[PDB]
Amino acid sequence: KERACRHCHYITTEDRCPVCGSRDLSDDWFDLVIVLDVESRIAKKLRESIPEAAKVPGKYAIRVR
Amino acid sequence: GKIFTVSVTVGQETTTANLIYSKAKTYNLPLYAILSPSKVKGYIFIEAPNKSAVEEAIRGIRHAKRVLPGEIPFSEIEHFLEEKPAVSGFEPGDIVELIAGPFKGEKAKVVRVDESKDEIVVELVSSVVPIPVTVRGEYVRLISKRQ
Amino acid sequence: RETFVDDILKEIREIIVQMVPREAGITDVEFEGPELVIYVKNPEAMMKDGELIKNLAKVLKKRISVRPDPDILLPPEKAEELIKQLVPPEAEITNISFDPSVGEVLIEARKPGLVIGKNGETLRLITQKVHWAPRVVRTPPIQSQTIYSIRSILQTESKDRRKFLRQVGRNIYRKSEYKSRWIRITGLGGFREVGRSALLVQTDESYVLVDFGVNIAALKDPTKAYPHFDAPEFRYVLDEGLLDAIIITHAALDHSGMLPYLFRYKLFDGPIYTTPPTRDLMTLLQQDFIEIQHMNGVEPLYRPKDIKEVIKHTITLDYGEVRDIAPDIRLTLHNAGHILGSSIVHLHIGNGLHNIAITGDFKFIPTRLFEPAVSRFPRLETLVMESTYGGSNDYQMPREEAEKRLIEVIHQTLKRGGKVLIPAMAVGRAQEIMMVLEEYARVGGIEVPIYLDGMIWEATAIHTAYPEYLSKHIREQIFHEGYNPFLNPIFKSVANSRERQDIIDSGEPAIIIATSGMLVGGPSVEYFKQLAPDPKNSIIFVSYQAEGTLGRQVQRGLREIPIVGEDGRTEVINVNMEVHTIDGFSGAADRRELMSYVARVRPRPERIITVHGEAHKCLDLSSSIHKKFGISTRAPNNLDAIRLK
Amino acid sequence: MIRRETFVDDILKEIREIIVQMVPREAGITDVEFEGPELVIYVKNPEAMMKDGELIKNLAKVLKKRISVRPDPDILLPPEKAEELIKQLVPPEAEITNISFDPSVGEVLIEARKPGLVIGKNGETLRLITQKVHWAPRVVRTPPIQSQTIYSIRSILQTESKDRRKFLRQVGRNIYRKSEYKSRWIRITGLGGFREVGRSALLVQTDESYVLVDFGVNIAALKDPTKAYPHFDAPEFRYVLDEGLLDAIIITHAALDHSGMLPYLFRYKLFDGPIYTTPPTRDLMTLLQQDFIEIQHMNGVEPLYRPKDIKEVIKHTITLDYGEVRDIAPDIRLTLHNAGHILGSSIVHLHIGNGLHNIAITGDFKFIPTRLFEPAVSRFPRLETLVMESTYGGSNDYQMPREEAEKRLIEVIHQTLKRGGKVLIPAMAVGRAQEIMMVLEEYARVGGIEVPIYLDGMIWEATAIHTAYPEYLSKHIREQIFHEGYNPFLNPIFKSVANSRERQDIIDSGEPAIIIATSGMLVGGPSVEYFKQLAPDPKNSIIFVSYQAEGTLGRQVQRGLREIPIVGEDGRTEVINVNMEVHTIDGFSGAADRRELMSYVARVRPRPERIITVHGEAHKCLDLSSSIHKKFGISTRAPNNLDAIRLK
RNA sequence: UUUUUUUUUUUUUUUUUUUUGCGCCGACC
DNA sequence: ACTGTCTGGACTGGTCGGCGCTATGATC
DNA sequence: GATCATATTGTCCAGACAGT
Ligand SMILES: [Zn+2]
Ligand SMILES: [Zn+2]
Ligand SMILES: [Zn+2]
């Protein structure tokens, strides 16, 4: 199963969080966002919404529940 | 860059987006970002400088049908990136339809709305007696808006 | 909520492996509803005798169900052959079913006593030589559609049933023996009124609903037809899904009418604890109610799939069997004597903290059908009693002269060549009338056939399927002797309208027992229409006739009744037949019977709650009990909560 | 909060239509909205609104609602010009102290020593000044003695004006979510205080609205949380709190066993809504909660709630006066009547539906005349169910009469002042202490004693609150304050200490004095220090006015034991020798005895259909219920906790 | 030394009588 | 006003019998 | 090993129409 972090909204397959090292990950999330370039327009839009998102390219989630 | 639409099989947008992302990573495709909202079914958004990059990225995948010949303005998909509760935007007194949950395919009237717990209380319209029930905000769909 | 079922299961497994010898080979231990299931690889060492199983059940205080491991399973054909060879030929085995998922074989036999054994040793022998846990049910002498349908539904949904049972067992044993801080009793319906009964038992840990029913008299008004769904406690229980179980006292629409409505809107997901006769009769009655509501043109309350879901969520309990339905509540059922499968609900909350007995509809005098209600309990503190006949002047006539008058009226009618039409309920008084008629005809008094039309045949078949729930006389006749009173050749069933027309047109005398006491539907109206002009015939009323019904119009003495004809014109029915009324066959307890039950109950309850009756009748009964015995009595209204402890 | 159907828009439209039809065009209606139970009307030209005083009364009678008329915020006088006009226009004898302006709603708060001059005959002065200033006035009484609690509450309300206005608007929208609705059924569940003393909790439940009455805490069994707090495990209470369906909370009087649990709900965000209480009750319950958390911190135990929770309780409290009928629910109307137990003590009267049923919850009350407060109101327009306290419901529970108790207290003070002995009277700050000071002042008025009386602790705050609210006192005290012009509270013999130095040098002065201190149980405060420094002083007297509980220093003092070892601070123990005589006068209690309860039952009007006896021991409650049933024939009940009784 | 809320009775049972379509190929008159 | 071009349509009735054809990829 | 959504979008005659 794939779970998303509650802090940086990063989806990872292991317990450790490779972005902020948070131990609270949520198994329920929607609207998967894939970031390949940091300077992307949608990455910039997500940055002003969630400050911790789009710091490192990879999978991301819009909301955590 | 520019937002482009890729028509994919309904209910399997996340896997197609993941395969496209992996192919772009492995083969160094000039793909900027990929957005796949859960509410949108059968369509994904890929940011690329030109549609030729999208066409080259999505080819070779059975589940990527075609790229829509057009460019989406960023204001159209701006609201998708913003995080808003599903309960918000609902007012008591209207009629909603429960897409999922134990009450699938049932019409209900909204009674109480609270954004703290992200839950909405509704009353079934076909019930002979009013029995309020608590359901998730994302499970309901607004049929009509009255009061 | 937090649960400790895993720790309890681990402790139980440790106790088992401490007590059971190692050669048995215990593999899995789990909970299936209110009983414990143990899987072993060597059933021979586990159950060489019943003493080990009895000791395990006594120590664990659970119902032990030993099943073989699924890996060691004989082929179904070899298993069937071995079961047929082991069972004596006197027990006629009809159907044998197998469950590949869990070790269990269902055996349908005409004589389940021989299959079970004198002390259960035959079941152990079968499950040892064949490695299949046996379950024995009775094949009725008269085929029943409802019971066959229920068995087919249970067999075809084995996986869902097993999942539901496992979930129920996990929910029941979420924690060990817990002492409740307080016990609360609230009545959502049936308090100071007749019909739409609903009793909620609330503790600090578990919630129990008792005889959730519906009202038919006030069906036009939704505020009185259904129990109070607006109660804050009931709303909190239903919204959070904290309802542990639902128990139905007996199969009647005022006690089980609202049960499928909860499953229609997914308001309930737990188990239902009724006796098998109660389950079958309540399913038949609910189906008939749905069909009647559909035929009347009104919107049906629920659907047959909801009744199927009720069947799939029903756990069957016998008389005197103690089962754990909650972490702090223990439930046992005792005979009530009202109808077939009628049970008095006894609740043992805590480890001796409190005891509640909900009698419901019951009878305390011996009858031709069932034994009198059980008045002895291991412990009793609060008693909930019906007050249908709680008035001071309410005194039903004794049974013997009422049945003598019925017999002499029938004999007089048959002497002149007339026909006897007896409108009656689907269950209850009809079977008592058939038993009385069979007793009268067994000595050669009458030779005319007795015709049962409508649901009378189905109810008779259901009654034959469960002879152990009947009275001691019928039980002795069926078991000790080879004579079945229900299997008399005088009882005939009419299949279609052609047979009914032949019966009506025949000049030979006959007795017809229809299925509509008020002549408001069914074959009763047709029989009355086609037999009214004949002066030799007679009609006997054995139940109260409500105002506005055809039966009340005939009973009052109306010689002519204008009705709508087939062509749309008014038709006149000339009632030249004799009219008789014998209301001595009512299954409800008399006021004298209620007083005798209060006086002779052991132990004496601390308080008595009077429900299920008119407000003045309930108040009169409570005042009479308080003045005669000194016990504190209350007659609360609806939405009233009483803190017993 | 939680969103509801909120049909208040149609009701407001109909009310505006009625106002337009009745009130003239020149009034200039601009905005009509609900601020709690009251109705707020904004007018461009308030001159034509109130040319005659009968128009507002007629509009209020027609609309059946309290109406507050304020000018539109578009036109407003400057605050300096408005203040100058108000100061120069009111009579100089009003003695206005502080003037505060609220430009958001166009309301001015006026604080004066004599609000009667500001209001005038049927509000003619108020109408004239708000016509000449174009500002909605609100008048409160400035106490002769400065009160820290009242000043802090007023400052908090003024500084938090916008959130208070938003909360009031939300409350008004929630109250009028439906029109005049007739309830189908009424039931009352006792979550606490039933067949027990303390931690009272009464929940009135209808098919539309839920009302909580007197949410309190128990201090005798605080060690066990099950017996200290109201029953939160009740399914009805859980359903009400989880769904946010609690319409309002009403407090009968300020006590820890009636209002001690209020900050707990706001600490964990369990309840969000209005609290209806008398302003003296609000001030005294805030003081009591502050004392409770202070003594909890001093004892080393974790406090139940923080002072910010008390501030939240203050910000969510709506104040009502005696005899004012207000709508708190679509089907429930609330009225408060005098109880006579303590200052601000009220009898909760609930009018459910349009004459469908009426419930009166007396709580703690007194029926005999009292020097401090008038006797409880026994006359109601409609009454069907009566809920009353049963603290002294036993047949032998007859208390010692006040007149000869006062005579005994006077002779004790005489025999202890002729010899020049010091006096120590341990009493609670809210209870019998004020009655003791009133008795002493009346005795010293003739000239029997001239030694000043020192009040140490929270007694000064309670005295200041009593001065700030004299209209809730007895008829004689109101007469003396208003027309006689003499203030019994302002006697020169009443002195207040400043710090521990004043206590120390008044201890070592040696002159005879009368000392009143809080913490009558002698568990803390200045009382223990005063007793420690008074124990070796020969020839002194101490009077006890309340019952003493086991395990306390007061019980040991009352027992008359010669050796009283008391553990001191910093982990060291101290031993003192007592030669100080003890006096026991339990005649100043504010709880009605058995005879008063029977007299109240007999003299109530109209006779209720049923009487429910609560707030007392189980045997006493049962005895009182049986006695009332045998004497008057009324169907009485003594329900236990978690018992719901259907009334209609 | 003080203003603006209201109040009361008429609707009954525990339930009922039968393979459509699609296309291809061959063939007769 | 002529003239070549694009588009739509109907393709004789009946009868005999036979011979196939009417899901699939991806979790849980 | 069992189920679940989804599953792609032949020539000739006559009438209407751009082109010169
Ligand atoms: Zn993270
Ligand atoms: Zn019944
Ligand atoms: Zn009190």
Side-chain angles (χ1 to χ4, degrees), chain C residues 386-548:
Chain C
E386 73 148 336
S387 326
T388 312
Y389 283 81
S392 50
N393 298 342
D394 295 15
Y395 281 123
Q396 323 166 7
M397 73 176 310
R399 275 277 220 278
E400 74 288 337
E401 74 276 54
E403 87 204 359
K404 151 169 115 47
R405 165 185 334 161
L406 159 86
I407 283 313
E408 76 107 354
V409 158
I410 284 181
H411 165 79
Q412 233 62 44
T413 306
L414 299 172
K415 190 140 165 282
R416 46 157 185 257
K419 294 218 186 49
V420 196
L421 169 66
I422 309 168
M425 265 321 127
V427 294
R429 303 162 165 117
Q431 275 74 41
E432 190 98 0
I433 288 155
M434 305 173 22
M435 272 321 81
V436 168
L437 287 186
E438 194 268 330
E439 163 102 348
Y440 180 50
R442 219 207 293 116
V443 308
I446 43 182
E447 197 35 22
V448 309
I450 296 178
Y451 294 110
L452 320 172
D453 215 330
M455 314 228 279
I456 316 291
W457 196 251
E458 190 69 35
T460 307
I462 292 168
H463 280 68
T464 56
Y466 304 98
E468 57 265 356
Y469 286 79
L470 302 171
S471 80
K472 248 138 54 171
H473 185 250
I474 306 196
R475 250 191 280 126
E476 165 223 337
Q477 276 186 305
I478 290 178
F479 294 148
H480 294 358
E481 281 108 290
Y483 185 73
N484 205 329
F486 292 85
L487 286 185
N488 219 279
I490 54 166
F491 294 122
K492 324 247 199 272
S493 44
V494 24
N496 30 46
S497 69
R498 264 256 48 82
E499 197 157 342
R500 174 171 329 124
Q501 196 62 55
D502 306 346
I503 286 156
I504 284 161
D505 287 328
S506 73
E508 43 256 28
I511 302 168
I512 303 137
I513 302 185
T515 176
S516 289
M518 325 271 201
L519 300 155
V520 290
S524 216
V525 197
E526 208 52 64
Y527 273 120
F528 168 67
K529 282 174 187 170
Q530 295 215 47
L531 298 180
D534 215 317
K536 324 186 282 179
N537 311 346
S538 58
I539 166 157
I540 307 175
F541 289 108
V542 292
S543 152
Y544 154 95
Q545 312 287 303
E547 293 291 325

Side-chain angles (χ1 to χ4, degrees), chain D residues 35 41 323 365 422 575 607 622:
Chain D
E35 275 195 15
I41 305 164
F365 77 106
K422 277 180 188 167
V575 165
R607 286 224 326 188
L622 284 163

Side-chain angles (χ1 to χ4, degrees), chain A residues 4-12 16-25:
Chain A
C5 180
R6 305 209 155 71
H7 181 236
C8 56
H9 288 221
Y10 193 98
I11 289 106
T12 180
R16 287 187 181 174
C17 194
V19 190
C20 61
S22 266
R23 297 176 184 171
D24 37 0
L25 311 194

